[PDB]
Amino acid sequence: TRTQLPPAYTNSFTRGVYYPDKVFRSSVLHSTQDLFLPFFSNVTWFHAI
Amino acid sequence: QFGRDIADTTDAVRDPQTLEILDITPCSFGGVSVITPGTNTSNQVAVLYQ
């Protein structure tokens, strides 16, 4: 048992966007219902310094 | 592997053994029209396509 720093909490945005399927799309807009990361979400910030 | 166009329709597939693009173009489209200028005069027609 030694000393340690308490974790923090930050904010992330414009992240967590990937391809929902293997279908090639170009010059066309499509909206699907798949798991992604919402914008401006409070996440847990870890450290290891 | 697959891919759609702008009309949101699956009509393209990439060849896994050639790494090329082969589009889908069916040859079954159009109609058949008949030209009959009255059967009381002559008995000749004309095959009209689309």
Swiss-Prot record, chain A:
> In terms of domain of life, where is this protein from?
Viruses
Can you tell me which residues are glycosylated? Answer: 42
Q: What does this protein do?
A: Attaches the virion to the cell membrane by interacting with host receptor, initiating the infection. The major receptor is host ACE2. When S2/S2' has been cleaved, binding to the receptor triggers direct fusion at the cell membrane. When S2/S2' has not been cleaved, binding to the receptor results in internalization of the virus by endocytosis using host TFRC and GRM2 and leading to fusion of the virion membrane with the host endosomal membrane. Alternatively, may use NRP1/NRP2 and integrin as entry receptors.
Q: How does it assemble?
A: Binds to host ACE2. RBD also interacts with the N-linked glycan on 'Asn-90' of ACE2. Cleavage of S generates a polybasic C-terminal sequence on S1 that binds to host Neuropilin-1 (NRP1) and Neuropilin-2 (NRP2) receptors. Interacts with host integrin alpha-5/beta-1 (ITGA5:ITGB1) and with ACE2 in complex with integrin alpha-5/beta-1 (ITGA5:ITGB1). May interact via cytoplasmic c-terminus with M protein. May interact (via N-terminus) with host bilirubin and biliverdin, thereby preventing antibody binding to the SARS-CoV-2 spike NTD via an allosteric mechanism.
How is this protein named in the record? Spike protein S1
Q: Which organism is it from?
A: Severe acute respiratory syndrome coronavirus 2 (2019-nCoV)
Q: Which residues of the full protein are shown?
A: 20 to 68 of 1273
